[PDB]
Symmetry: C3
Subunit: 397 residues, 3 copies
C-alpha cells in the first residue's frame, strides 16, 4: 500500500490466519451422577420421583445406538369419701385418655413428618442437582448437535485453575479468544444410560497453528471522478499484502472473526502480476470501468468510520442549507462525531442508538400455672400439718 | 424480465437489501441480583447453600480478565386419708412430668421447625430465582459467545411494552422480523463478580438501513431442447434487476433470509452489457453450451413449486402407463397437488410428509371427654352438698 | 483419477449429495400444560406464585401478533377435707388449661401446617414441571429463532419408539445423522397464550432426496519440482468425478458435513473439456504456473493425514541433524504416528493434544411413668379395701 487515495482504495481491519487440522479421539467415560440413598426410608418416594424424572428427561436415543343417727351418719360420710375416691378413679381414667392420644400419633407420627420435611429439603437439593446437570452440558444435553461446550465442563479437571489449563498446553490469547467467542469446538453424545447415569460426549480440543506475518487488509472499492465520467477500479475486496510478492484471498469456505480468519485448510495460490502492479501504483494496469448503476455507493463504512464524499452526494447533518464539501483532489473525507451531532451521509438516514445497556430488572425482595401449683402445694402441706397434730394428741391412751 | 420462458429462465423469490454498519459501545453495569437476608436465622443455611451454588455455577473467567378399738380405728382411717393425700402428691408429680416434656421440646423446637419449613419455601423461591436467572441470559450466561439475546432481557426496561420499544426508534416490520428470526445481535460477557453478583454483557442494537427499489430475483437455469441437442445458457443464479440498467449480485459473504438478504457492506459493481442484452431478449448474445453431464436437472424446484419437464424425463405419479406430457413449445410445466396425489418427477422419489405438528405430551396430573368431665363435676358438687348439710346440723351446741 | 501423483493431486473425503425442496405447513395446536388445582385450599398461594412466574417468563410477544373439743374437731377436719376437695377443683381447672391449649392450635393448626408441607412438595413438583418445560423446547422457547428442536418434542408422539418413527417414513442412516448433527430443521413460535398455556411452533420434517452415484472427491493442489522451477497446476479444490463425463462443483451456497454436502437447490453445469483432459492424464492441457509466493504450502493435511514433502522443506521430529527425505520422483510422503513421536512438518510446530476426555466432576454426596401409675393404682385399691371392711364391721346395729 502507498499514497493512492485518489483511486478510492481504503485499508480496513487486519485479520490473522490460523490453521486447524489436528483431530483427537480418545474419549473415556467417567461417572458424574451424585450418589443418593435412603437411611430412614424417608426419601424413598423422593428418590423414585427423581428417578422417574431423570428417565423422562433422558431420551433412550435408540436411533444413535442402532446406527452406530350419728353412728350411721359417720358411715354414710365415709361412703361419700369413697365416692370421692371413685371420682379420683375417674380422674385416673382421664390420665390415660390424653396419654392415649400421646401414644396414638402425637409423638411418633409428627416426628416421622419431620423426616419428611428433611426429605423435602433433599428434594430442594435435587433441584440444585438439576442445575448442576444444566450447567454440565446445557444445550449439548438437549440434543447431540455440534455446539459450544460449557467452560465449567472443560475446566475444573483437577483444581479449577484456568491458568494451569492454559499453561499446560501452548496457546496464545488470540486463538483462545477466537475459540471462546466463535465456538469452534464440536460435541456429540455417544451413549446415554438411564440406570448407571453416565453420559459421554466428544470433547474437542483444537490446536490452532499460526503463520508469521499472515496479515491481510480489507479494501473497499470507491468510484472516483476523472474528467467528466465516474470510474471504478475492479479490485477484489479482500487481498493479502506482504512486502512486494503477495497473493489473493478466497473466502468461499472461510469464517472471519473480529481480528482473525479461521479456515479448515489452506488456499494460497499465485496471483496475476497485473493486479500487483495496479496496487503498487501503476494506475494504467488497473481495470477502470464506467459506473452504469446508481446503486454503487459513493462512501465507505468500516466499524463506524464513514468516508463521506460530499463532492457528488450531500452531507447534511443538522440543517438543509449548508453545502459543506472538500477539495476536488480529495475524494474520501472522514465524518465522525466530532464534526456534527447526527451526520446523515447521502439521502439515507443513518445514526447511532439513543439508549443501550443492561436494563434494570429486580427479581424479588425477601422480607420477614405456677401460682396455682404453688397454692395447691401450700394447701396440701398446711392441711395435713394442722390435721395430724390435732388428731393425734387429742385422743390416745 | 420478459416472455422468455423458452430459454429456461424462471423467476423466484424477491429479497430486500439492508445495510448494517453502525456499532454502539456505551455499556453500563446495573445490578440485578435479588436481595436475600435472614431475620430469624432460619434461612442462614439456605443462604449459604445458595451462595455456594452461585459460586460453583459462576466461573471466575480469569482468562478474560487477564486478556482484557374404734378410737384407734378412726385414727388409722385418717392415716389412710393421708395416704390418699400422698397419692394426690404422686399425681402432682405426673403434673410436672408431661409438663416437663412440654417444657423440653414440644412447644419451642417444633415451632422452630416450622420456620425451617418457611425456609424450605424460600428455597423453592430460590429455584424460581434460578429460573429468573435462566431467562435472564440463557445460553449467553453459559459462555461468552455471540448468540441470540433473550427478548425479556432487552425488553421490560420501563413498562415491558414492546410497542413503545419499537416506536421510540424508527424501525419496520421486515428488519425486526429478520433480526428476531436470524439473530444478528452479538453478546459478550465483560466481567463477572461472585460477591456483588453483577453480570455485564455487550448489548447490540443494530440499525438497519434500507435501499429503495432494492429488489432482486432468483434465476434457475434449465436446459432447453433446440434442434437435436440440449443447450443450457450460462447465467448467474442470482442477478439484480432494475428497469433497464442493473448489476450483478455477489453472495460470497452475504447471508440470505426468507424474504431479504443481509450483508455487512456493499458489493455493487458494473456488469458486462452482453449479459444484460441476453437477459433482455437477445438470445444470440446468450452463452449456450451443450450439456455433457446427466447430472444436470431438467426440472426446477422453488419452495414446493416444481416445474416438471415431461418432454424428456417422466412424470409418473400414480401409475406406470400414463405418458402425460406437454407441447413441444412449452418446456416447464407446473406440477402441484391439484394434478395428482403424489407426484414423482423423474426417476427420483419425492413427496411431502404424512404427519407433522406438535405431538401430545402431558407432564403429570395433580390429584388429592365432655361426658366424663360433666359426671365428675356433678359428683363433686353433689357430694359436698349432701355431706356438709348432714354433718353441720347433726352435731352442735 | 489415475496414477498422477507427480502433479500433486491428492484425493480426499467423499461427500454424498442430497436435495431438500419439499416444505410442509400443517401445524395444529395441542395443549400441553399440566393440570393443577386445589382441593383443600393449601396450594392456592403456590398456584398463584406459579401462575405469576409463568406470566413473567412468558413474554406477550405482541410484536409477532401485530406483524402477523373433739365434737368440733371432727367438723374442722371435715372442713379440711372440703378444702382438699377445693384443691381437687383447682386440679380440675388445670384439666381445662392444657386442654385449652390443645383446643387452641396444637391439633388443627399444626395439621394445617402439614398440608402446607404437602404444598411444598407440590412446589417441588412444579420445579420438575419447569424441567419438563425446559426439555420441551429449550432454546426455542427462549426466542422464536430457527434452531435445533429437541428430540423429545418430536418423539414420544404415541409410544416414544424411535424405530417406529424412522420406519413409518422412508429414511436412511446418512440423512438422519446429518439432520441430527447439523440441525437443518427450523422452528418459529406462532402464538403464546398466558391463560390457556398453549405454545405453537413450526414443526419441520425435511424429506431429503438422494442422487445415485453422487460421489465427489476433494483435491488439494501441491506444487511440484520440474526442472529448476516449482510449478503449480491451477485446479479447483472441489470437482465431481463420474467415470468419464463429469462436472464442476460450486460451494458458494452449499453446506458441507462430515460425509455429505447439503444444498437447497441444484447447481450442475457443463465444464470445459480442457480441465477433464488435464485430470485424465494430459499434463500438457494443465495450467501450470510458477510459484511467486513463499506462503504456498508444500505439504497437504487431511484429517490428520500429512503428506510431508521433505525434498524442499524439513521434516525434523525429534532431532535436528537427521535429513530424512525421499526419492526425487516421489513428491508427497505420508507422515503418521508410526514414523516418529511428534512430527513437525516444515518450520511450523504442529502436534496433537496431550490430554483429552471427560473430566471428573462430582456434584455432591448424600449422607445421613408406668411404675408410678401402677403404684398409684395399687395404693388406691388397697386403701379402700382395708378401710371399708374395717369401718363397716366395727360399728352397726
Amino acid at each position: 500500500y502507498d499514497s493512492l487515495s485518489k483511486v478510492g482504495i481504503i485499508k480496513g481491519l487486519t485479520y490473522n490466519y490460523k490453521i486447524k487440522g489436528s483431530p483427537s479421539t480418545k474419549l473415556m467415560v467417567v461417572k458424574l451422577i451424585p450418589n443418593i440413598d435412603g437411611v430412614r426410608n424417608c426419601t424413598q418416594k423422593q428418590f423414585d420421583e427423581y428417578k422417574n424424572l431423570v428417565k423422562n428427561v433422558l431420551e433412550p436415543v435408540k436411533l444413535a445406538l442402532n446406527a452406530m343417727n350419728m353412728k350411721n351418719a359417720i358411715q354414710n360420710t365415709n361412703e361419700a369419701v369413697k365416692q370421692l375416691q371413685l371420682a379420683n378413679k375417674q380422674t385416673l381414667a382421664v390420665i390415660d385418655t390424653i396419654r392415649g392420644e400421646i401414644n396414638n400419633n402425637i409423638i411418633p407420627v409428627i416426628n416421622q413428618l419431620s423426616c419428611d420435611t428433611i426429605g423435602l429439603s433433599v428434594g430442594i437439593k435435587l433441584t440444585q442437582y438439576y442445575s448442576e446437570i444444566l450447567t454440565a452440558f446445557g444445550p449439548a444435553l438437549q440434543n447431540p448437535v455440534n455446539t459450544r461446550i460449557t467452560i465449567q465442563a472443560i475446566s475444573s479437571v483437577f483444581n479449577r485453575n484456568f491458568d494451569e489449563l492454559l499453561k499446560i498446553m501452548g496457546y496464545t490469547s488470540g486463538d483462545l479468544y477466537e475459540i471462546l467467542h466463535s465456538g469452534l469446538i464440536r460435541g456429540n453424545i455417544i451413549d446415554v444410560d438411564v440406570e448407571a447415569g453416565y453420559i459421554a460426549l466428544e470433547i474437542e480440543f483444537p490446536n490452532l497453528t499460526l503463520v508469521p506475518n499472515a496479515v491481510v487488509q480489507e479494501l473497499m472499492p470507491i468510484s472516483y471522478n476523472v474528467d467528466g465520467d465516474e470510474w471504478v477500479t475492479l479490485v477484489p475486496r479482500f487481498v493479502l499484502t506482504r512486502t512486494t510478492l503477495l497473493s489473493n484471498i478466497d473466502t468461499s469456505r472461510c469464517t472471519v472473526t473480529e481480528s482473525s480468519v479461521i479456515c479448515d485448510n489452506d488456499y494460497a495460490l499465485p496471483m496475476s502480476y497485473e493486479l500487483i502492479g495496479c496496487l503498487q501504483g501503476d494506475t494504467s494496469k488497473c481495470a477502470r470501468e464506467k459506473v452504469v448503476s446508481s446503486y454503487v455507493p459513493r462512501f465507505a463504512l468500516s466499524d463506524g468510520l464513514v468516508y463521506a464524499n460530499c463532492l457528488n452526494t450531500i452531507c447534511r447533518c443538522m440543517d438543509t442549507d449548508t453545502p459543506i464539501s472538500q477539495s476536488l483532489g480529495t475524494t474520501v473525507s472522514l465524518l465522525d462525531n466530532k464534526k456534527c451531532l447526527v451526520y446523515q451521509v447521502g439521502d439515507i438516514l443513518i445514526s447511532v442508538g439513543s439508549y443501550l445497556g443492561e436494563g434494570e430488572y429486580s427479581a424479588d425482595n425477601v422480607e420477614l400455672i405456677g401460682n396455682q401449683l404453688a397454692g395447691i402445694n401450700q394447701t396440701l402441706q398446711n392441711a395435713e400439718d394442722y390435721i395430724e397434730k390435732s388428731e393425734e394428741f387429742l385422743k390416745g391412751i
